[PDB]
Amino acid sequence: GRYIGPVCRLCRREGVKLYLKGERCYSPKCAMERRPYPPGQHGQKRARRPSDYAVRLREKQKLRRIYGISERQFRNLFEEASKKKGVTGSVFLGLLESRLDNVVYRLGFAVSRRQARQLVRHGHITVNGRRVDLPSYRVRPGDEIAVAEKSRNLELIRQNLEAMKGRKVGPWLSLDVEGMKGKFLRLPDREDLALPVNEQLVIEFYSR
Amino acid sequence: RNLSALKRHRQSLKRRLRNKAKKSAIKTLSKKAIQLAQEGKAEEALKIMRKAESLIDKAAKGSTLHKNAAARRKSRLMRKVRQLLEAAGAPLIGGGLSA
Amino acid sequence: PKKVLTGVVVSDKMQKTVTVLVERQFPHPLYGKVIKRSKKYLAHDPEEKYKLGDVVEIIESRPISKRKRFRVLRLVESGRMDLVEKYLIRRQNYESLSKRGGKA
Amino acid sequence: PTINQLVRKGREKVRKKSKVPALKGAPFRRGVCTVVRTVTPKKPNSALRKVAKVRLTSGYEVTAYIPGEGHNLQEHSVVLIRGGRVKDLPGVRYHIVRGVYDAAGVKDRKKSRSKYGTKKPKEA
Amino acid sequence: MLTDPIADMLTRIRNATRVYKESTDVPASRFKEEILRILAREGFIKGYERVDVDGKPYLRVYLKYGPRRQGPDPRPEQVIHHIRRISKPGRRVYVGVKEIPRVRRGLGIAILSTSKGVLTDREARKLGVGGELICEVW
Amino acid sequence: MVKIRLARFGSKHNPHYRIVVTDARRKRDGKYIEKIGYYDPRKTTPDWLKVDVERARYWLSVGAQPTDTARRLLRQAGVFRQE
RNA sequence: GGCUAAUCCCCCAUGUGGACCCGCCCCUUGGGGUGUGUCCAAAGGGCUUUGCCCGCUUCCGGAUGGGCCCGCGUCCCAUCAGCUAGUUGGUGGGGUAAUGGCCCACCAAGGCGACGACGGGUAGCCGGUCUGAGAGGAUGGCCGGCCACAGGGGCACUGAGACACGGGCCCCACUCCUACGGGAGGCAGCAGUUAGGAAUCUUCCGCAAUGGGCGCAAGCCUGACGGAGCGACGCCGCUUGGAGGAAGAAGCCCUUCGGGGUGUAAACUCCUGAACCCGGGACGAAACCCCCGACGAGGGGACUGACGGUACCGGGGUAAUAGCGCCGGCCAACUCCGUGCCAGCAGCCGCGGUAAUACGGAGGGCGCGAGCGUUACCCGGAUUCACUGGGCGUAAAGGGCGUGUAGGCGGCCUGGGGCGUCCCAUGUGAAAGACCACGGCUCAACCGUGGGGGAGCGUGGGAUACGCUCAGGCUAGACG
RNA sequence: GUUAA
RNA sequence: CCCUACAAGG
Ligand SMILES: [K+]
Ligand SMILES: [K+]
Ligand SMILES: [K+]
Ligand SMILES: [K+]
Ligand SMILES: [K+]
Ligand SMILES: [K+]
Ligand SMILES: [K+]
Ligand SMILES: [K+]
Ligand SMILES: [K+]
Ligand SMILES: [K+]
Ligand SMILES: [K+]
Ligand SMILES: [K+]
Ligand SMILES: [K+]
Ligand SMILES: [K+]
Ligand SMILES: [K+]
Ligand SMILES: [Mg+2]
Ligand SMILES: [Mg+2]
Ligand SMILES: [Mg+2]
Ligand SMILES: [Mg+2]
Ligand SMILES: [Mg+2]
Ligand SMILES: [Mg+2]
Ligand SMILES: [Mg+2]
Ligand SMILES: [Mg+2]
Ligand SMILES: [Mg+2]
Ligand SMILES: [Mg+2]
Ligand SMILES: [Mg+2]
Ligand SMILES: [Mg+2]
Ligand SMILES: [Mg+2]
Ligand SMILES: [Mg+2]
Ligand SMILES: [Mg+2]
Ligand SMILES: [Mg+2]
Ligand SMILES: [Mg+2]
Ligand SMILES: [Mg+2]
Ligand SMILES: [Mg+2]
Ligand SMILES: [Mg+2]
Ligand SMILES: [Mg+2]
Ligand SMILES: [Mg+2]
Ligand SMILES: [Mg+2]
Ligand SMILES: [Mg+2]
Ligand SMILES: [Mg+2]
Ligand SMILES: [Mg+2]
Ligand SMILES: [Mg+2]
Ligand SMILES: [Mg+2]
Ligand SMILES: [Mg+2]
Ligand SMILES: [Mg+2]
Ligand SMILES: [Mg+2]
Ligand SMILES: [Mg+2]
Ligand SMILES: [Mg+2]
Ligand SMILES: [Mg+2]
Ligand SMILES: [Mg+2]
Ligand SMILES: [Mg+2]
Ligand SMILES: [Mg+2]
Ligand SMILES: [Mg+2]
Ligand SMILES: [Mg+2]
Ligand SMILES: [Mg+2]
Ligand SMILES: [Mg+2]
Ligand SMILES: [Mg+2]
Ligand SMILES: [Mg+2]
Ligand SMILES: [Mg+2]
Ligand SMILES: [Mg+2]
Ligand SMILES: [Mg+2]
Ligand SMILES: [Mg+2]
Ligand SMILES: [Mg+2]
Ligand SMILES: [Mg+2]
Ligand SMILES: [Mg+2]
Ligand SMILES: [Mg+2]
Ligand SMILES: [Mg+2]
Ligand SMILES: [Mg+2]
Ligand SMILES: [Mg+2]
Ligand SMILES: [Mg+2]
Ligand SMILES: [Mg+2]
Ligand SMILES: [Mg+2]
Ligand SMILES: [Mg+2]
Ligand SMILES: [Mg+2]
Ligand SMILES: [Mg+2]
Ligand SMILES: [Mg+2]
Ligand SMILES: [Mg+2]
Ligand SMILES: [Mg+2]
Ligand SMILES: [Mg+2]
Ligand SMILES: [Mg+2]
Ligand SMILES: [Mg+2]
Ligand SMILES: [Mg+2]
Ligand SMILES: [Mg+2]
Ligand SMILES: [Mg+2]
Ligand SMILES: [Mg+2]
Ligand SMILES: [Mg+2]
Ligand SMILES: [Mg+2]
Ligand SMILES: [Mg+2]
Ligand SMILES: [Mg+2]
Ligand SMILES: [Mg+2]
Ligand SMILES: [Mg+2]
Ligand SMILES: [Mg+2]
Ligand SMILES: [Zn+2]
Incomplete structure (x- = not known):
């Protein structure tokens, strides 16, 4: 692996x-x-x-x-x-940049890319409402990456999203801290990274 | 072992015999007519020729000699007779060749 | 369309049959150079109408015999023994290539 | 050459000779040891290189190298040949695979073990 | 007897330009003149003109060159840096319109002889026709 | 005789048929005379059954005999409706 | 030897029509029409039984499938150069659905070859596949198309179709059964055995789906097929954990003995939960059939799942496989000890002779990871057979010299033709694959739908500069 | 006499 | 084991 x-x-x-x-x-x-x-x-x-x-x-x-x-x-x-x-x-x-596990990282749901990967594998994530546990799933402009309902209570997910409060997010993304949900707006420009x-x-x- | 459809073999054998016997009658008569025409025996020859014709077409009703194969025979036959006869006699019985 | 080829008559030593030599030139598949290749067709001449040296048209036809599937369509021009000559010498040349040659 | 010459004779596709007549161009070949000799290397080198004369199923009888420090081959040891010559032994163009047939894998080997056919030892 | 009167001309020109001659003569022929027309039009040469050398028809080709130059070897750059025969006796080169080459991204030219007359590769592409790829220049 | 039937083109546990006009004697996934529609038995797409109705009508009119299933699908697509 | 039915066989009739001879007409190879003469048809069964269904006869046409023919293309050896008697053509027959030396009688003396005949070697050919910037090289496993074969050789019968893998006959080899006379047999179908080999699987499930054969239908057969099993054989997706954690345990390796390394790695804290365990539980299947309607259209109704209690859902829930190659240069990664031209390494260059970054082990490091290496083979790099794209004074390479045959090549001007060449339109270029887009399995692999392709060859039309050909002229090459 | 620097 | 790491010599 x-x-x-x-x-x-x-x-x-x-x-x-x-x-x-x-x-x-x-x-x-x-x-x-x-x-x-x-x-x-x-x-x-x-x-x-x-x-x-x-x-x-x-x-x-x-x-x-x-x-x-x-x-x-x-x-x-x-x-x-x-x-x-x-x-x-x-x-x-x-x-x-379009790898789900990565997007999860860019939105703060996870503190590291590896953590993000586990978050996805263990099904605590979701694309457009549906569960997706594939770290390599390719996110498309328009998709909404969110924390799964059943898991909106994981002590870990609280902290990470609590810390996301008042934190800026990549120009090509949008994060809704309260609703533990984000959105992949556009592909990042080289100048965006x-x-x-x-x-x-x-x-x-x-x-x- | 034992595929009962060796019944196909049996049948083939009879059919073979039926076909075989029809064709012989055909050759034999055809030869007989060309033989008479080649002798001037107009009426007699034409007479037989029609039999040949009938036997040939009849043969064409089933697998025996089905086809243009029939035509080819009638043709070749009605050809040698008329030619052989013209080389001497007149189409008497005229029971087959057209005026 | 039945094929129609144009060629010279290089032989009439056959009854009702003429050997028509047919040429064609075209770009060599790899080197480009416009090369020139040819072939002989045995054509049907029922009337023995065509003579040695004739440049005739040949046309695809229902087999007349083995080795013979073309009939002479028409005469294009004649008395072109220059063409026959080339063919003949080319052939003459050959009998001077093996252990049975002779003329220089 | 002129283009005409190229049209007349064209170029010649030249083929390569095998450095390994293990017949069928099989990746390997089985055989029996005819002789288990020792051989001296060429010029620059000096040593008692271990070689074996093998009679192949491919109908050939070629000499093959016996890599490694170990080695337990005798005049009837059945073994597998693989091809790979020895720069030092003119004539030796194949290697005997250790760990296959009567050819014991090199014992106590702890490094390039998969070559030399040596299983993994228990670590603790 | 020459075997490629065209190649001969491209060379007479090539050799002359190489020693900075003012002009150079070439045995006359319509086809050759037609090629010269383009060289002139394209500004590879000052131009040309019929002339009679010892009674026979020739074509004075007036060559062009850049300005004198700096440092060592003040010889001027060439206008005609490269003039090469493509199609040749016993290896004629023919191209369909979609096969007409683009010499030096346009900076150079190709000269084909089409059934619509001799044309630069652009003129050929324009009139939508191909033909014999005579040579290339730049 | 000539037929209108289904040819398998999906993939394991994922069939996708091509409604086809092929000689009865040919292997089912072989060379057919002409494609005339497609069928997705699992309707994994709003587009799970299409049929070139006119083309079908043409073949039926010349003797093509439709497989029972081929006929079901053909009908669902209005090939036999009269009005 | 005897009896007997039919959709079995035959005779007669009817002749829509059709076949054949001869004539005429149209058309042009045997195409269509027409006249006389002649010849040729048939089968019955079922019932929701006065009228429907299944079916039979003849003919014309359609559709699908196919035979035969022709142009062009299709590997290596010229240390294979001459080959040929059914051979090449003719006339007349035979044969076939049909042309044809396909076969025969007879007549003629021809046919083929350096543009490579004949002989030898090798090989099923394509769509494609792999590689390559391309040109090209290599290839033809899986899938689709065509061909060929069914233990070896020959042969015909039956039939619309075969000269027939699970039909027939003969010869040969082999196996088995024989009361020794004489018989039976053919897995290159699925699975399996055995032999050979480096090497290639289950004597599986099901006929549910798609497709096929027979049947009015019910339905029967179908190792075709749809599935499951085995093998990292390939491809794609996934795991072996996530966050915290010391100026940094121990062990082990270096050391100048000060300390440096393995390393936040471990331990340990906390979090999530591969496995597993419960409960639910598919899509693939709606037809055939039945009822209404008219056995149509249309509308209702019923049966049916091998895979599989699988996929997928929901609940609970354990911290839970890592290996392999390599570290002198090429080429990413260095130290200690052992060894002492030994033992050994090695793709090429090379390394080992007592301090070896190259051997063997260790610590450390680099690379990739359920893989990693090795061997074999193909393309590449190799413009290293050079068409794109090479060369020959001394590197490999000018023939010892000439004469001249075939062939290749060809000065200036005009005209005809339009073979090469170029242009337009059009037919062909199956599907799959490749490419692009979108879409279906959570992604992907895989798959679906749609889009775009071209060379080549056919057809019609057009151009004429160049090459070609014909015709005329010229004098600068050539000869006199 | 061999192989090295 | 003497020579120089060896071969050959003692
Ligand atoms: K009549
Ligand atoms: K018909
Ligand atoms: K056909
Ligand atoms: K004949
Ligand atoms: K090939
Ligand atoms: K190919
Ligand atoms: K209905
Ligand atoms: K669960
Ligand atoms: K653990
Ligand atoms: K030591
Ligand atoms: K080392
Ligand atoms: K290579
Ligand atoms: K020489
Ligand atoms: K000589
Ligand atoms: K002209
Ligand atoms: Mg790009
Ligand atoms: Mg039966
Ligand atoms: Mg008799
Ligand atoms: Mg003659
Ligand atoms: Mg003939
Ligand atoms: Mg070449
Ligand atoms: Mg030695
Ligand atoms: Mg050495
Ligand atoms: Mg090797
Ligand atoms: Mg030149
Ligand atoms: Mg130049
Ligand atoms: Mg009896
Ligand atoms: Mg009766
Ligand atoms: Mg009957
Ligand atoms: Mg009538
Ligand atoms: Mg009538
Ligand atoms: Mg006519
Ligand atoms: Mg008529
Ligand atoms: Mg009539
Ligand atoms: Mg009657
Ligand atoms: Mg004949
Ligand atoms: Mg005939
Ligand atoms: Mg013959
Ligand atoms: Mg030729
Ligand atoms: Mg040959
Ligand atoms: Mg073979
Ligand atoms: Mg290349
Ligand atoms: Mg295939
Ligand atoms: Mg055979
Ligand atoms: Mg066998
Ligand atoms: Mg046999
Ligand atoms: Mg056989
Ligand atoms: Mg028959
Ligand atoms: Mg048979
Ligand atoms: Mg069998
Ligand atoms: Mg074995
Ligand atoms: Mg299997
Ligand atoms: Mg079934
Ligand atoms: Mg069925
Ligand atoms: Mg059965
Ligand atoms: Mg299967
Ligand atoms: Mg395997
Ligand atoms: Mg950790
Ligand atoms: Mg369950
Ligand atoms: Mg359903
Ligand atoms: Mg279902
Ligand atoms: Mg059923
Ligand atoms: Mg009713
Ligand atoms: Mg209905
Ligand atoms: Mg817990
Ligand atoms: Mg390095
Ligand atoms: Mg030692
Ligand atoms: Mg090593
Ligand atoms: Mg190394
Ligand atoms: Mg993997
Ligand atoms: Mg190359
Ligand atoms: Mg080479
Ligand atoms: Mg070249
Ligand atoms: Mg060179
Ligand atoms: Mg020299
Ligand atoms: Mg030399
Ligand atoms: Mg010389
Ligand atoms: Mg000459
Ligand atoms: Mg000229
Ligand atoms: Mg010439
Ligand atoms: Mg033309
Ligand atoms: Mg196409
Ligand atoms: Mg086209
Ligand atoms: Mg296609
Ligand atoms: Mg998708
Ligand atoms: Mg497509
Ligand atoms: Mg055309
Ligand atoms: Mg002209
Ligand atoms: Mg002239
Ligand atoms: Mg004069
Ligand atoms: Mg000495
Ligand atoms: Mg040495
Ligand atoms: Zn860090």
């Missing part, structure tokens, strides 16, 4: 702060706070000039770890984006 392993070691490797724990990744301790260098016995030893290949591979491993997708699905999305009209780079992020990723390098990685 998914990764399921030490995640702050991934941030360290990528030399950038990836938010894979939601909270704590804000505390004085995402480790990127103390030891923002690679994990392992040689983590501090002087680094060596990376090969053009290495750069792409990492930038890609970076953009993929952020969403927590397998290389299998990641590449499939990438291929779908290549076939599609318009800048592959953005469209790819467009699709990545602030990803520490240079999607081009990723495209290049696959041209090889």
